[PDB]
Amino acid sequence: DPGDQICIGYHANNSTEQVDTIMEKNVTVTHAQDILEKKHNGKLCDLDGVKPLILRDCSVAGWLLGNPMCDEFINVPEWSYIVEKANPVNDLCYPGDFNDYEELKHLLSRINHFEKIQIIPKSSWSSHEASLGVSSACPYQGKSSFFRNVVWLIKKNSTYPTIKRSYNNTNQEDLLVLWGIHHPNDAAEQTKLYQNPTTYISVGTSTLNQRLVPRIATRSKVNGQSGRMEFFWTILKPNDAINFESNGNFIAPEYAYKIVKKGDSTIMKSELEYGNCNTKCQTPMGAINSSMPFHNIHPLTIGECPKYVKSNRLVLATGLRNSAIAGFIEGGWQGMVDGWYGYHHSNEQGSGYAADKESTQKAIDGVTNKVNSIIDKMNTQFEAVGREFNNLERRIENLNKKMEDGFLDVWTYNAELLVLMENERTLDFHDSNVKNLYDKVRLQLRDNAKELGNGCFEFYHKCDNECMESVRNGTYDYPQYSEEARLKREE
Amino acid sequence: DPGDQICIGYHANNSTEQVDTIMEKNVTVTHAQDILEKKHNGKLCDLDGVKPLILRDCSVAGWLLGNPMCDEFINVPEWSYIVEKANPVNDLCYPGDFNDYEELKHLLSRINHFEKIQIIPKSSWSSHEASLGVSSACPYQGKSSFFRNVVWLIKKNSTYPTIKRSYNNTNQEDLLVLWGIHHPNDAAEQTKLYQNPTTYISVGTSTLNQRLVPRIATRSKVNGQSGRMEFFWTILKPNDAINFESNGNFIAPEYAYKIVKKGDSTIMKSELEYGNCNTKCQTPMGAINSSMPFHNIHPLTIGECPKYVKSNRLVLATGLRNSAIAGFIEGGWQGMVDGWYGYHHSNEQGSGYAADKESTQKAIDGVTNKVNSIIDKMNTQFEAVGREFNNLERRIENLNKKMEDGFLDVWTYNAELLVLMENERTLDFHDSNVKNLYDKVRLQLRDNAKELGNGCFEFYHKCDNECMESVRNGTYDYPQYSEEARLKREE
Amino acid sequence: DPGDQICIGYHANNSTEQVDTIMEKNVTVTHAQDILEKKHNGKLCDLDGVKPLILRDCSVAGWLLGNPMCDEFINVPEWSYIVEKANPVNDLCYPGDFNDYEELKHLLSRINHFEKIQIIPKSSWSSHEASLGVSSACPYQGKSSFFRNVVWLIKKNSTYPTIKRSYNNTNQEDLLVLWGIHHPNDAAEQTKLYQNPTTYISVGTSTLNQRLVPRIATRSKVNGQSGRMEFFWTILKPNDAINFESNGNFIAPEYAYKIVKKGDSTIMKSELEYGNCNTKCQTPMGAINSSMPFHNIHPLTIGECPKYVKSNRLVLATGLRNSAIAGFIEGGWQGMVDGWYGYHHSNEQGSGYAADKESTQKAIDGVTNKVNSIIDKMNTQFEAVGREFNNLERRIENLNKKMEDGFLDVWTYNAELLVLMENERTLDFHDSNVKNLYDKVRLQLRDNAKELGNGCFEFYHKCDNECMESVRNGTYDYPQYSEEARLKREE
Numbered sequence A, B, C: 001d002p003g004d005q006i007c008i009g010y011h012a013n014n015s016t017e018q019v020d021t022i023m024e025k026n027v028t029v030t031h032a033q034d035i036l037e038k039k040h041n042g043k044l045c046d047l048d049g050v051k052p053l054i055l056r057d058c059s060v061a062g063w064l065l066g067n068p069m070c071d072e073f074i075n076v077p078e079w080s081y082i083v084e085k086a087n088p089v090n091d092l093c094y095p096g097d098f099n100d101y102e103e104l105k106h107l108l109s110r111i112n113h114f115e116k117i118q119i120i121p122k123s124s125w126s127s128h129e130a131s132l133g134v135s136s137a138c139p140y141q142g143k144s145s146f147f148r149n150v151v152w153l154i155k156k157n158s159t160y161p162t163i164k165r166s167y168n169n170t171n172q173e174d175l176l177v178l179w180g181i182h183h184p185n186d187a188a189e190q191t192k193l194y195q196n197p198t199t200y201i202s203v204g205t206s207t208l209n210q211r212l213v214p215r216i217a218t219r220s221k222v223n224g225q226s227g228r229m230e231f232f233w234t235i236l237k238p239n240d241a242i243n244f245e246s247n248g249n250f251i252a253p254e255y256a257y258k259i260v261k262k263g264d265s266t267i268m269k270s271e272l273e274y275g276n277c278n279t280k281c282q283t284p285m286g287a288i289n290s291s292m293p294f295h296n297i298h299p300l301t302i303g304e305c306p307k308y309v310k311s312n313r314l315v316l317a318t319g320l321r322n323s324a325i326a327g328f329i330e331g332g333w334q335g336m337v338d339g340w341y342g343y344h345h346s347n348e349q350g351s352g353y354a355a356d357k358e359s360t361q362k363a364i365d366g367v368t369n370k371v372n373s374i375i376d377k378m379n380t381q382f383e384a385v386g387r388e389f390n391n392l393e394r395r396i397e398n399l400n401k402k403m404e405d406g407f408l409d410v411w412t413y414n415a416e417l418l419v420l421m422e423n424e425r426t427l428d429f430h431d432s433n434v435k436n437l438y439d440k441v442r443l444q445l446r447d448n449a450k451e452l453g454n455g456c457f458e459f460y461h462k463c464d465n466e467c468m469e470s471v472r473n474g475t476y477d478y479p480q481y482s483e484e485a486r487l488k489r490e491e
């Protein structure tokens, strides 16, 4: 009237944070953690401390050949990836084609050193016109012009003698060399420009064995030209020579490019500003600081990125189901201001809440470990995802699509089920921990107290604060009080 | 002699349905659900309400060029995919080759609009023979013939003047244009057919810059011909023109094809009948209504399909382990005609079974949620799986094989383990629910009754049907009967 | 003073074996099993009882054409895969190129029958020089030589008459036929070697329609040659004929190869010895006997292999957490020499340990099943992983890299989490089993004994060895002793 009491219960708070489990939707929970990265800085950034190459209105092709309408950031000796607009305004001003263009973009996607040098001075053409090879298709300062890195040689007097030029790579580095051939409209234009009716370009390295022949066809006007310019490239190794021989139609190198190549990336399509930021994961929509194992921003990423997932939320439960003084069988304790599982007692020294420090710490460590495993076991590797295939490589582009879609399907399913399964394990863990605490006490107390059925015990003896501490410590001395207990019990 | 009683127990039935768990094989279970789709309608069907193009005995090539032995369904203005036989009987009647054939099949796999038009009338050839270009290799009504969409021009008198033809696409739609070149057996055949010993075909658009030259070689007879026909195609954009120039060996266009293209699919190899059905997933062996997240019919599918898996059964447990009146410790209750977990009682008003409605509903909802999650979290995307690579693309075909086999291995393993793990969770859930019910009662009753050890309690007081209902409701008033209980108890 | 006793407890041993769970790191455990294969025999082995083709210092190209510096194992009529060194010393002694080289390596990766035959005897050249076609680039026994399978025909007197040669495949098997063209340095060398200034090679089968023309360019010296040799191949079906016609520059077949092809593999890069072993999984670093579902040796494997994983250990718990006489609440029993869960008793016949055979067997079966499922559900398929793409196929090689890296990421994550999740299930299973045993006893004994709170019961009646056996058997007859029990109890 009334006997001392100890109750077992668990933390409750004012959290409205919701979680899903394999078995229940929308469970209110004490604390939760999202493992889905959803935020980007809306900028293009350095990748592992190397600037990108941003081409504002120029194709890689326009940029390499010196399309004179390309007004770009000129000096840039290395880069980590390339940014183009979807459809650049300035490509090949004089219409035509670039041989193995996509393989060259991929080779140039990431470059350790890039330095333009002069391999054949425009001034070295003594028996051909170096300054007439100009077109209204390729306008400069209002006046007719041409690609600036490459020379459109025309006949001098009414003669086009055979060109023989060798260039020996005396540099330490590989040379990217560019040249072209003019496909004229007819035999009259052919002889008007090059005098000789039948022409070739021969090009030889230790590797290359090329002979080009112009092709006449009747073609639609593009940039007001029915002629076509076709471009070719090789990499000249650092002690090899390249040998040019031509009768006509030769678009000669003036400038070539020293390159050092240490691994590739790809070409990103984006309309974003550079932002001086560093990042380890770039997206067409912005960069990401990628601690989280999953993201939903954009598939077309370059770097060490979270796995891309079709998903709005991946929220793990970290806390508990959230809902005399009665114990656990009737709900949680707002009063348990600290601790996850613990006790409420009332004796002649007064009443209050005490955390079970040991079971609380064990459980916090467990849940922290669960979250860190799900994050830290994720293998993160460098990859570069772009669209590098042309409109006659549609079968290969379909192969890439099935693979990308394939991985999106596997990761989206596994992350969703992983969160549902583990959330159910976590909430069941909390129930298992509370019930085990109740049993820890029930087994110490035996017949020295009575189970009240609500998660509380009423003692058959005086249990001061020091007795209570021994119950919470698991050091309760049953023999010490069996005598006093038995007297009140038999009555 | 004898006291009132309440027992805790669970549903049992005459089910022989079996399930596997990570830990036990062949567990008999009250109710189970298969999540593996194994059934197909054995027919080719519309895909999202668009008919397929079924070519009974004709290659795409034979069909486009008008191989005169192709007796096909002529009119068909759109389609969702193409069906060919493994080795069609009718391909190129006059032997030869089709340039970038596989890329053209892929472009044509799915078409929004397809309409054949006449771009160059057979009657427009005033200075060349339009009706002699015929062969015994390409038989029609017993008589020698040729591809019907394309004209094999021969010299007239003993002259083959230079052809110059332009066609301007004044249509709203892209044009697929087809032409070819004849590779004759020798210089005598060359001049016998075309008079001129040295010939070319030049073709130009805003894109195309082609010059073809016939090739003599001594070749094996195919369909009794040692000559070869080589075919080329372009897509002419809706305000461009195509310009043809030829000296000889020209297989001229007569008919071209207006096309509208909105996304691709692939070419399916099947010997099935069309069936007027609609479907969202087509298989070479038949269509599928794809609610289930997995299937085992065939890898080579087109549409939004379940994931393909090497597996005969993926069966989830939905019910319970299946096996006075004693309670749960001795087995299940055939008498529990309704409910999963509940009670049996016996008092002076009589005996019977009562379902624990709350715990039963919670558990049914849980298991329904588990099944729906495993089904509904599956990301389903459109894909088209075929074999689109030629016998010099074997490395790329091996790349595709490793990817396909890769995904089959991941999905087959994850589905099998998913079912084994969750089956074990489900059966352990049922045990956890029954035991918690027993405890719900034990904690209400305390010393007002005695545990019989078999899942039953014997009351120390009269418990009429209204007392029993309060035990099942969790509203049992222990104080109301402690007095009566204690008297019978002390004795 | 003192009463008979029965205790519930579990096995403990001197194991230091450690395991991880989703929630705890470094749990000491009674017994564990690694499912990650980490061991290889450091040798190249037969694959499913078929020898490899090991090329010690020769390229496939060098080997097929008979580079005279290739000192290889000559006779070898079938093989399962090919082994090359990263950069073979002996390739094309006379510099040049091999057309569709990579597709030919892939075709030859695995061969059922391979037999070199003579299709055109060197002695059959009556109007051309068959023994002058020799070079200092291709040295033999100190003296100038050439590829041995193919004849470099030179003019005789000062004449190079037109070659016309047919070979009809009268063999039962497909023929791999090889030929080439010489690209000389200039018009003087052209006529010095072949007399005719303007030359061609025409080659025709039922399939092939080729016309080759030599190409002059000024080229860097390689093996002291500025000339180039370009090689071509076809597969001649078993009743077709191949027809050669040439004016000059013809590198003629002498020897061709009968082949039978039944499925492909790839080319492995390794510096290992053959070892007479058989295997179902070969690695560049050594073979594997692949019972385990995962391995971490090397990605570039051929056969039916475990899944490749970035991981040092995948260790499953199979045993228990490892740590009067007290029962389970105070730790494990070194004394439980046999069994997982069981009992300790003490009566007037003496004291000792007894295994709960039924619950122990159920648990051993469960854990054995868990391990076997995780191993046996793994779909294992034949695959061949190599690097088969050239330096202008870098985009496709990047496609293959993303796929390979993709599968490594999926398998590494799923195996790591699978082991963490199941380890937690296994340890929780053991706790659930021990606690259920304690309850099995508590429910049989009821008030005929008292719970001591440490996992032990003290009996209120004499419990001889035969009573004890009935408690362990679940056949304990409570009524038989309630009388004796109640007397000692009321006191």
Ligand SMILES: *[C@@H]1O[C@H](CO)[C@@H](O)[C@H](O)[C@H]1NC(C)=O
Pocket (backbone or CB within 6 Å): A025, A026
């Ligand atoms: C869960 O919560 C949200 C409210 O934020 C609601 O939209 C949804 O309908 C709820 N229930 C289910 C079954 O998803």
Ligand SMILES: *[C@@H]1O[C@H](CO)[C@@H](O)[C@H](O)[C@H]1NC(C)=O
Pocket (backbone or CB within 6 Å): A157, A158
């Ligand atoms: C071209 O150059 C000069 C005339 O300026 C003259 O010496 C030369 O012969 C001219 N050639 C011809 C063929 O007119």
Ligand SMILES: *[C@@H]1O[C@H](CO)[C@@H](O)[C@H](O)[C@H]1NC(C)=O
Pocket (backbone or CB within 6 Å): A168, A169, A239, A240, A241, C220, C221
């Ligand atoms: C280029 O110059 C170097 C250094 O003078 C020389 O050794 C080398 O042979 C030259 N390269 C060629 C292909 O001639």
Ligand SMILES: *[C@@H]1O[C@H](CO)[C@@H](O)[C@H](O)[C@H]1NC(C)=O
Pocket (backbone or CB within 6 Å): A466, A467, A469, A470, A473, A475
């Ligand atoms: C637990 O509580 C008792 C009583 O307050 C105290 O004396 C003892 O030091 C504690 N025991 C342990 C092991 O912490």
Ligand SMILES: *[C@@H]1O[C@H](CO)[C@@H](O)[C@H](O)[C@H]1NC(C)=O
Pocket (backbone or CB within 6 Å): B025, B026
């Ligand atoms: C399980 O059930 C089937 C009978 O339908 C039987 O074939 C199989 O052998 C049984 N046991 C095991 C271990 O698979």
Ligand SMILES: *[C@@H]1O[C@H](CO)[C@@H](O)[C@H](O)[C@H]1NC(C)=O
Pocket (backbone or CB within 6 Å): B157, B158
């Ligand atoms: C061919 O056409 C007619 C003869 O029918 C004639 O006017 C023409 O000159 C003929 N040509 C030759 C060269 O025979």
Ligand SMILES: *[C@@H]1O[C@H](CO)[C@@H](O)[C@H](O)[C@H]1NC(C)=O
Pocket (backbone or CB within 6 Å): A220, A221, B168, B169, B239, B240, B241
């Ligand atoms: C085709 O006709 C249109 C309309 O007459 C014209 O504007 C267009 O320029 C023509 N196309 C070409 C390439 O000439």
Ligand SMILES: *[C@@H]1O[C@H](CO)[C@@H](O)[C@H](O)[C@H]1NC(C)=O
Pocket (backbone or CB within 6 Å): B466, B467, B469, B470, B473, B475
């Ligand atoms: C439960 O049972 C009692 C006795 O039949 C009834 O009076 C009461 O309305 C019920 N209580 C609830 C909360 O359903």
Ligand SMILES: *[C@@H]1O[C@H](CO)[C@@H](O)[C@H](O)[C@H]1NC(C)=O
Pocket (backbone or CB within 6 Å): C025, C026
């Ligand atoms: C676990 O065990 C190993 C000792 O073998 C140790 O290196 C490691 O630091 C321990 N703890 C954790 C948290 O990994």
Ligand SMILES: *[C@@H]1O[C@H](CO)[C@@H](O)[C@H](O)[C@H]1NC(C)=O
Pocket (backbone or CB within 6 Å): C157, C158
């Ligand atoms: C080459 O062969 C012999 C000389 O040995 C002779 O009959 C033949 O005419 C020679 N040809 C020429 C054109 O010298």
Ligand SMILES: *[C@@H]1O[C@H](CO)[C@@H](O)[C@H](O)[C@H]1NC(C)=O
Pocket (backbone or CB within 6 Å): B220, B221, C168, C169, C239, C240, C241
């Ligand atoms: C090759 O010889 C066979 C048998 O004599 C013959 O039937 C076949 O037609 C020949 N092949 C060719 C293409 O001539």
Ligand SMILES: *[C@@H]1O[C@H](CO)[C@@H](O)[C@H](O)[C@H]1NC(C)=O
Pocket (backbone or CB within 6 Å): C466, C467, C469, C470, C473, C475
């Ligand atoms: C169990 O133990 C009792 C007493 O030793 C023995 O008589 C009986 O045969 C056993 N019962 C069973 C079912 O094994």
